[PDB]
Amino acid sequence: KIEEGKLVIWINGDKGYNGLAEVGKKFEKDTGIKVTVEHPDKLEEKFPQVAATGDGPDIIFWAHDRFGGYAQSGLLAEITPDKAFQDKLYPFTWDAVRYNGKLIAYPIAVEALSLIYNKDLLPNPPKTWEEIPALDKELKAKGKSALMFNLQEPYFTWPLIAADGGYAFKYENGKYDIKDVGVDNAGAKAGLTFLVDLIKNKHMNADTDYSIAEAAFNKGETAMTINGPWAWSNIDTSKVNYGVTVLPTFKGQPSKPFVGVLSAGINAASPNKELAKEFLENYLLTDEGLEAVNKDKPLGAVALKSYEEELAKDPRIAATMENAQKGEIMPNIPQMSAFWYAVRTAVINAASGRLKEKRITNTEAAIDTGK
Template sequence: MRKFAVILLVALVTLIFAQQKLVIWCSEKQVDILQALGQEFKARYGVEVEVQYVPFGDIKPKFLTAAPQGQGADIIVGAHDWVSELVANGLLEPISSFAEINQFFETGLEAFSYGGKLYGLPYALEAIALIYNKDYVPQPPKTIDELIAIAKQIDKEFGGEVRGFIIPATTFYFVVPFIFGYGGYVFKSTPAGLDVKDIGLANEGAIKGLELLKRFVDEGIITPGDNYEIMDSMFREGRAAMIINGPWAIKAYADAGIDYGVALIPDLAPGLVARPFVGVQGFMVNTKSPNLALAKEFLINYIAKKDTMYRIYLADPRLPARKDVLELVKDNPDVVAFTHSAANGIPMPNVPQMGFVWGAMDDALNLVVNGRATPAEAAKTAVERIKAQTQ
């Protein structure tokens, strides 16, 4: 009798699912693989999956308009920093813990968490790392002191024709690994989420990070005018030995014939790792979807699986969010290095107040590298400005 009841339940669930259709909105790179996965899901469960291409920049605003009316996509694919706005508008469904959640990098899960709940299934990470030219640096430095020593030697040997080390000196995103590595933070992380009233960009660790930036300038390794365009073009031209950049830049370096390597940003001190910002892409469920249970089932018991995530990686080769998928691609040293850098990192805050941080901190970096304020003074001014705009 019990066996018959189970069979009846499975048949009933199959019948209900067969009457439903899942709609997914995604950007161009995910369309083909999600269509293929959707066809397989339909063949297995009898549920139609309709994948609709929406330009990446249009997904969130279109969803904000359609979802409150019970329309639009059941699932969207997008960035983790959409979460706060979508949750505030009551449009995202929390995802409960599932069997293989521990296979996902904590950084990815943290990125899609808000108010202590998980609101997205991560599939791809993004972070910066050290990129080095093997013609000048056969083995990457393990510590910042080693990096400085190597950079100085190259500067001296080539008389400025080749730069030992370059970063965009006044761009917060590229200086963050030093600030966070020493213990600075943007907004305090708590079990209930980010505390936007607790800003850690002028604490002792943040000031140490800015002091390191000033050391680079004072010792002639970088200049106040160093920006992304200078860094990127000099590395492509073989005139920079070490830079910090992201996976988006690798193809251009390979096409330019640079014999490059990717490594972790060197430790700030023994056991004190650099911690870059991390961006995360993932799947989010429309809480107003008429197919809510099915949408969650599709993500947790189909998309979240190792084999499926590996196929998504092959179709859209970004840094994998699952640890065991990284094991499958460990023969790609670039992916391994960038992913380990991301695993060390901190997700970009997924709260709207983050919008006020970028300009304030870029201005603070300008003050520091041009000698117009001490690191402590510049950090204090930046935090006061952020607080005035956010609180």
């Protein structure tokens, strides 16, 4: 049961949940309506489990990719912003939360992964993945490492996997072919092999997760990490002298991070849909609401035109958009959970040296005269 006369909001533990609570406290002061913000573990799997039986939060925050599956399961109210409000957000962000012709969430901000580097350890960041092994050797002599990032979530490895030809679903003339998954082609496998080669040569560790990689970068132990805008505030606190830049190329080609649009859906079972609307349109999606969240954990490039223009001069945001442009927007189709399962299992299996993903490489006889 979802309680009438208040709002419960769920958002991931890596985002600005304290900032969101401040927006909630402003809502309460104006309207008398209490706003509870929670950040439960494995939210993206907990939400569909509790919402299916009419439980869970009034409002769910996640990247847009999961929303088509939620909508297909009947978990989301249709949202009905008027034209005046629609004009306040960028068309590209609205289309990210459109599913089979209908708006199914409010878009909040555009996210992509970037390379984050410690300027005192690394005054010029590497342009290529290929130079990282040597760079790590140089740093290991000083009791440091080149690179740590989260290897438990396939989101973080995706940019490397996609670089030489990995894709989610084939997309042509506005239509996905869900039978044509690009997680096991030559390009994808080259990315996975490179990843395995880093692990096997002890430049990275298969067990490294979000918190381990954050702690290492933010304590000055490792020169680089890969993360999204949300991570910048913990780095500010640590006072490491960092830059945010374009991801390294692989086989000459840009890394292709998936682009997510942080989105806010309204639970179909909420008796507080009107309060949810009023909170999202008139409190969160304002200059002052987004400032409060962004000052907790940065959102990236916000959907709200007025505030996105204010922040756009931030070179960390400029780097985020450069990387986003090189990558692709996540599909929101219900088969996205199946894509992520496929990649998650492939990445975990490869890193851990399981028999399924184990291959002998350097078997190809190439013509190589130059160059």
